[PDB]
């Protein structure tokens, strides 16, 4: 059980290079199952989630290897099943379903069970597939999909906004007969990145980034080389690290147009922000941040992946501020942990009410969320004394060497094998 020993208070300042988007690398690796030629994905972050992706790819019969790039050879895919052991350690595995059925006419993926942040049904995934002409059945816990011949382009209108389902249907449609039109699709930057990867392979897609996506099926997909976009959540996390420590930072290898909502909130907190074509600068001017009000929602609104980070900001800010969660109703585990550190907060339903304090106190806290838990590490950096963050394996799933980056910012952080 690895742990993070953190020494505070520490002023976070200097520079950081942003890694490739974890949430773009993932769908792309799964979309590779469609490719008939070798493919090279560049700028992929070194993190646990990518490893599990590779492991799955490999079991399916693909030839995989990695460094900064990931090499995938999906010519010999001979097995069509994402087993219980894998899906349980990473619900995103569900992504194997679509490519599998669109290409081999068959696909068996384990039905994801309960997750600690809230209700996570995949009804939209299954539903979208059926509309494409697939027959789906549930046996032994496996959602079994099949289709005689090829999928059928269709007009699909989405009940609710879903990053996962939009990618499942989008991918499966690239190999169907005719035109598919997804209505009420998710606009996430990562979906644009996945569509772009698809086009590079010979797929015909338009509308990515808007509520309407149009796919024109083709008989086959080739190979190619593709560079994954910068990680917006990583970028936001570092910007916040500087904002709560009264420091200044420059983010290198970034994509500003991807953070409208987050940047706006930072300004409201009183930060001095500048942007270039591939950089973002943040200066607090020695100032303590001002409380802000946030409301999570699908892109381009404020993202739930930045939620715990902003809760932290409010917790050490001047005044009272609220954060409402409309995507993951119960994504609040971090709050009680921050409470062990001296934070003042109350949770009313799906809203956390924050009362900012001058300073936090080191304590023993526990990570549980691959993204939200980074807030515990950030708290450790500015808290008074020593903080021990337990179970960082969660954080290893979502961040590429977060200790190294923090250390280069002035943080007193250590990884122990106790
Ligand atoms: C791997 C990956 O990219 N995961 C991300 C993706 O999850 P996803 O699961 O696809 O998100 P959704 O489908 O947009 O989530 C939609 C909302 O809608 C409900 N819903 C979803 C599907 C469905 O069929 N039926 C249905 O009802 C669902 O319950 C949820 O409340 O989108 C989330 C929101 O941005 C991210 O927080 C999440 O990050 C994670 C943490 C990470 O970094 O690993």
The domain segmentation of the chain, as residue ranges, is 1-18+230-418, 21-228
Sole residue written with tokens 């921050």:
338
Q: Please list, residue by residue across 237-271, b when 16 or more beta carbons sit within 10 angstroms of its beta carbon and e when fewer do.
A: bbbbbbbbbbbbbbbebbbbebbebbbebbeebbb
Architecture of domain 21-228: Alpha-beta prism (3.65)
Experimental method: X-ray
Query: What is the number of helices (H) and of strands (E) in the chain?
Result: 14, 24
| Backbone gaps in the chain, preceding residues (C–N over 2.5 A) | 67
Which residues contact residue 241 at a Cβ distance below 8 angstroms, ignoring those fewer than 6 apart? Answer: 12, 247, 249, 378, 381, 406, 409
- DSSP assignment string, 150-204: --B--EEE-SS--HHHHHHHHHHHTTSBSEEEEES----HHHHHHHHHHHHTT-E
Q: Which has the closest alpha carbon to 189: 174, 167, 169, 172?
A: 167
- Sort strands 248-252 and 14-17 into parallel, antiparallel or unpaired: parallel
Which secondary structure element, helix H or strand E, spans residue 52, and what is its range?
helix 48-60
CATH 3.65.10.10 matches 1-18+230-418: yes
- Kindly list the distances between the CA atom of residue 248 and the CA atoms of 10, 240, 335, in Å, as whole numbers in the listed order: 13, 10, 26
End-to-end CA distance of the chain: 7
Half-sphere exposure of 137 (CA within 13 A, CB side): 6
Q: Which residues, in sequence order, are bridge partners of residue 418? A: none
> Is 162 annotated as a binding-site member?
yes
Resolution as reported, in Å: 2.5
Asked if 364 and 343 touch (Cβ cutoff 8 Å), the reply is no
Structure tokens at 381: 């950096």
Question: Is position 76 annotated in a ligand binding site?
Answer: no
User: How is the beta sheet containing 320-324 ordered, strand by strand?
Assistant: 294-295, 320-324, 351-355, 344-348
Order the strands of the 39-42 sheet from edge to edge.
63-66, 70-73, 39-42, 224-227
Closest CA to 182 of 156, 159, 160: 156
**How far apart, in whole angstroms, are the C-alpha atoms of residue 6 and residue 112?**
35
Going through 32-94 in order, the beta strands assigned E by DSSP cover 39-42, 63-66, 70-73, 81-82
φ, ψ of residue 281 in degrees (nearest 5): -115, 140
Contacts of 140 (CB under 8 A, 6+ apart): none
Residue 410's nearest CA partner among 242, 183, 216 is: 242
Collect all residues with Cβ–Cβ distance below 8 Å to 113 and sequence separation of at least 6.
88
Q: Are 33 and 217 in contact (CB under 8 A)?
A: no
Whether residue 165 contacts residue 158, with contact meaning beta carbons closer than 8 Å, is answered with yes
Nearest-CA residue for atom 33 of ligand 1: 163
Q: Ligand 1: does its nearest atom lie under 6 Å from the Cβ of 418?
A: no
Among 75, 45, 37, 84, CA closest to 57: 75
| Ligand 1 centroid distance, CA of 299 (Å) | 12
Q: Which segments of 271-380 are extended strands (E)? A: 272-275, 279-283, 294-295, 320-324, 344-348, 351-355, 364-366
236/18 Cα distance (integer angstroms): 10
Nearby residues of 26 by Cβ (< 8 Å), 6 or more positions away: 49, 50, 53, 92, 95
- Alpha-carbon distance values, 138 to 21, 108, 129, 169, 247 (Å): 33, 10, 14, 19, 53
| Neighbour order of strands in the sheet with 212-216 | 155-157, 179-183, 212-216, 204-206
Does the beta carbon of 371 sit less than 6 angstroms from any atom of ligand 1? yes
CA dist 232 → 31, 120, 221, 299 (Å):
21, 23, 29, 12
Give me 98's structure tokens: 């679509």
**What are the backbone angles phi and psi of residue 146, rounded to the nearest 5°?**
-150, 155
Q: 15: Cβ–Cβ under 8 A, 6 or more apart, which residues?
A: 249, 250, 251, 252, 408, 409
Q: Which atom of ligand 1 is least distant from the CA of 327?
A: 31
3-state SS class at 276: coil
**E strand residue ranges, 285-366:** 294-295, 320-324, 344-348, 351-355, 364-366
* Ligand 1, pocket-test mutation among 168, 327, 350, 367, most atoms within 8 A of CB: 327
Classified as helix, coil or strand, 301 is coil
d(CA 186, CA 281): 29
Topology alike, domains 1-18+230-418 and 21-228 = yes
């Amino acid at each position: 059980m690895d742990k993070f020993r953190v020494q505070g208070p520490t002023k976070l300042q200097g520079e950081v290079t942003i890694s490739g988007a974890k949430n773009a690398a993932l769908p792309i690796l799964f979309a590779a199952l469609l490719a008939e030629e070798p493919v090279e994905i560049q700028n992929v972050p070194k993190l646990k989630d990518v490893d599990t992706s590779m492991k799955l790819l490999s079991q399916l019969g693909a030839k995989v290897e990695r460094x900064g790039s990931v090499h995938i050879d999906a010519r010999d895919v001979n097995v069509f099943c994402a087993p219980y052991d894998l899906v349980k350690t990473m619900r995103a595995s569900i992504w194997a379903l679509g490519p599998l059925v669109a290409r081999f006419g068959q696909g068996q993926v384990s039905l994801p069970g309960g997750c600690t942040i809230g209700a996570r049904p995949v009804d939209l995934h299954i539903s979208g597939l059926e509309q494409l002409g697939a027959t789906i059945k549930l046996e032994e816990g496996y959602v079994k999909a099949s289709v005689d011949g090829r999928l059928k382009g269709a007009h699909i209108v989405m009940d609710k906004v879903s990053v996962g389902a939009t990618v499942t249907i989008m991918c499966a449609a690239t190999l169907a007969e005719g035109t598919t039109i997804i209505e009420n699709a998710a606009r996430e930057p990562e979906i644009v990145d996945t569509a772009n990867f698809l086009i590079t392979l010979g797929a015909k897609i338009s509308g990515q980034g808007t509520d309407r996506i149009v796919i024109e099926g083709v008989e086959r997909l080739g190979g190619g080389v593709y560079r994954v976009l910068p990680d917006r959540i990583e970028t936001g996390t570092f910007l916040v690290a500087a904002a709560i420590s009264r420091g200044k930072i420059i983010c290198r290898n970034a994509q500003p147009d991807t953070l409208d909502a987050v940047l706006a909130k930072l300004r409201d907190a009183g930060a001095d922000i500048e942007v270039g074509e591939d950089w973002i600068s943040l200066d607090m001017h020695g100032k303590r941040p001002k409380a802000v009000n946030v409301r999570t929602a699908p892109h381009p609104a404020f993202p739930t992946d930045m939620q715990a980070q902003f809760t932290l900001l409010n917790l050490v800010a001047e005044g009272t501020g609220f954060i409402t969660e409309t995507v993951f109703e119960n994504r609040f585990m971090h709050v009680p942990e921050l409470s062990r550190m001296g934070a003042h907060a109350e949770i009313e339903s799906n809203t956390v009410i924050c009362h900012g304090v001058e300073k936090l106190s080191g304590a023993q806290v526990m990570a549980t969320d691959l993204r939200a838990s980074a807030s515990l590490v950030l708290a450790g950096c500015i808290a008074e004394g020593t903080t021990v963050v337990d179970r960082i394996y969660h954080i290893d799933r979502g961040y590429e060497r977060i200790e190294d980056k923090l250390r280069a910012l002035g943080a007193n952080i250590e990884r122990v094998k106790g």
